[PDB]
């Protein structure tokens, strides 16, 4: 009935001159294993070593030398750390983007394959190693649709195993399957898949970030009409937000003793002193991390630097609110992802990376034994997208759909009204996909 039709999920169903883009002193083991498997199907391997945060202009000129090239594999995201900093700094994100941009500049007309190490986890037995490499998958999905010519696809591999590469890769790069989102494992090879889904109550205080703005504003007043005791709405503007006055009044009406606080979810301190400010009498029971990112444009120009900087509220807010609730017993920890991480549409390159992180963090939370929820939203309330298949969901329709998603206590539920007839043809117009097969 109504909601069921717009509820989906990711599964992983089983189905089956080159350059190697690699960092100096990184992947070595996986680069030699890649080279062996590649020439074993008749193709000269030559290494393309990359500098940390490469200038696309200098890389363009190093590709205008090597001569005719039939393809290029990337081990940038292989054997990588995350030096105790911002999750979407990740050199390999900044450099996949400046690599792709530079190939297109150097006019190779050959595609690019990015491999990642346990970025995906094919069902709830495997773990997500580093949620950031998920960003590679998001952005990579929206590069496909903006420039088919240059994007081969993504291929996830167990943390530190060259073995799965060695047999399959030959196939994956030349295979006529039309699989571009693959996961290699010991128990065979798996493909990324979109499928439809099968058929809670708030307590103490429940905190919502973005709570003074729209979306968070609807979550705030949904949470009250669903009978919440106490609501802590936070945002950079807090009480000084336009209509924050008429908001508390509107849901103080609906039996909710709510408070509106200024807070920079990006700053470890600003939230610590927000969490230490909730009365002992009314403890913190659930969070709804709805803080937004706003970065439009195309993958033409978009850089790792722009993504990282424009996504902090959503991303650092997640990593902060996770960090500072890990040792507290709370009901729901609800991250707001979107259809940009789910399938990814032209001009959502600025949104995909951030929501990919949120997707990964929930997975690796319920993995570690914590109550996470990574809702991949479609469009919401008040022309170019209404035509291309995706149509707006009313606030209440979306919220009620969340109500069940928590009842089930699913980790990564997709929630989106999609008129499929137009959407498929609009999504495949320029590049064939095998993702929506099972509908």
């Amino acid at each position, epitope marked *: 009935d109504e909601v069921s039709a717009l509820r989906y999920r990711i599964e992983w169903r089983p189905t089956g001159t080159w350059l190697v883009a690699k960092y100096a002193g990184t992947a070595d083991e996986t680069s030699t294993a890649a080279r062996e498997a590649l020439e074993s199907a008749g193709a000269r391997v030559r290494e393309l070593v990359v500098d940390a945060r490469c200038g696309r202009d200098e890389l363009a000129e190093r590709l205008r030398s090597v001569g005719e090239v039939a393809g290029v594999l990337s081990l940038l995201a292989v054997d990588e750390a995350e030096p105790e900093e911002a999750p979407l700094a990740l050199a390999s994100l900044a450099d996949t983007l400046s690599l792709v941009q530079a190939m297109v500049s150097a006019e190779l007309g050959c595609p690019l394959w990015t491999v990642t190490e346990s970025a995906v986890a094919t069902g709830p037995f495997e773990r997500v190693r580093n949620a950031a490499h998920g960003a590679l998958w998001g952005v990579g999905r929206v590069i496909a649709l903006e420039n088919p010519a240059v994007w081969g696809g993504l291929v996830d591999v167990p943390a530190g195993s060259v073995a799965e590469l060695a047999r399959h890769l030959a196939a994956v790069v030349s295979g006529g399957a039309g699989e571009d989102q693959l996961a290699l494992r010991a128990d065979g090879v798996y493909g990324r898949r979109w499928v439809r889904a099968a058929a809670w109550k708030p307590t103490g205080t429940v905190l919502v970030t973005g709570g003074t703005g729209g979306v968070g504003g609807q979550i705030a007043r949904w949470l009250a009409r669903r009978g919440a005791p106490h609501l802590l709405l936070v945002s*950079r503007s807090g009480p000084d937000a336009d209509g924050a006055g008429e908001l508390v009044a509107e849901l103080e009406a609906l039996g909710a003793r709510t408070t509106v606080a200024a807070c920079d979810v990006t700053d470890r301190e600003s939230v610590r002193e927000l969490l230490g400010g909730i009365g002992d009498d009314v403890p913190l029971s659930a969070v709804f991390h709805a803080a937004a990112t706003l970065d*439009d*444009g195309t993958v033409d*120009t978009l850089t790792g630097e*722009r993504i990282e900087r424009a996504s902090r509220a959503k991303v650092l807010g997640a990593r902060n609110l996770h960090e500072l609730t890990r040792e507290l017993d709370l009901t729901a920890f609800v991250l707001f992802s979107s259809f940009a991480s789910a399938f990814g549409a032209p001009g959502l390159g600025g949104y995909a990376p951030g929501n990919a992180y949120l997707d990964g963090l929930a997975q690796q939370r319920r993995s570690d034994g914590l109550p996470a929820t990574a809702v991949a939203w479609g469009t919401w309330a008040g022309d170019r997208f209404r035509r291309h298949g995706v149509i707006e969901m009313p606030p209440e329709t979306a919220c009620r759909a969340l109500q069940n998603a928590l009842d089930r206590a699913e980790v990564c539920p997709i929630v989106i009204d999609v008129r499929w007839d137009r959407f498929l043809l609009a999504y495949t117009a320029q590049r064939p996909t095998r993702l929506f097969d099972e509908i």
Partner: antibody
Amino acid sequence: AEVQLVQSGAEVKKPGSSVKVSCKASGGTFSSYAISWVRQAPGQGLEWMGWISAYNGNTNYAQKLQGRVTMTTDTSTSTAYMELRSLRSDDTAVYYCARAPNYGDYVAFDIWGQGTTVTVSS
Amino acid sequence: QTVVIQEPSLTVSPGGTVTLTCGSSTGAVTSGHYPYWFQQKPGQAPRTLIYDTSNKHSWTPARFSGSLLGGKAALTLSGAQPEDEAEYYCLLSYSGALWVFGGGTKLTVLG
């Protein structure tokens, strides 16, 4: 960086009329960026007016303006326009456009127009 | 309605260091407020010296520096020169794609 912005020449207006100031963006790609506008009354501070998206024509306006200001982009001429209706005397100011440099943020103020002086008087 | 306060005016001697601050009425200015620093010599348009609390452009002189000093944003001029006589504006990012400028500091360098 080597993105410049060049604005319309000076304008003099009477109360109740309109002004459409232009900001043409040469020297780099135009499409993946928001042009932001700011004004400054004689010998007073910079005030934020709003931003127009060159990507999807979206707009956020300063409340005190809403209903009097319209920001538009011409992807063709690679220029942004700011248009202020029903002017009164306190709308006298120098109006500035600003955006990111060449591989910079969406809503940014790194690069500035040269300004357009608009005088409104009886 | 958020108000951003700078010192109206400050005077430094050549070689001196002077430190401007940018507070907000709504709370602690912090790096999610994406503080910018702008310089406006008389007759001219703003030039931008600092973005993202502390990042310099190539045209920013070394002697300028952006920081968070206890709840405000801070620009610090070290070994000031006559050519730095200017108005300095800070700009902060809030809420629903809102931005609010400080009133400016008139920095005088005694030449």
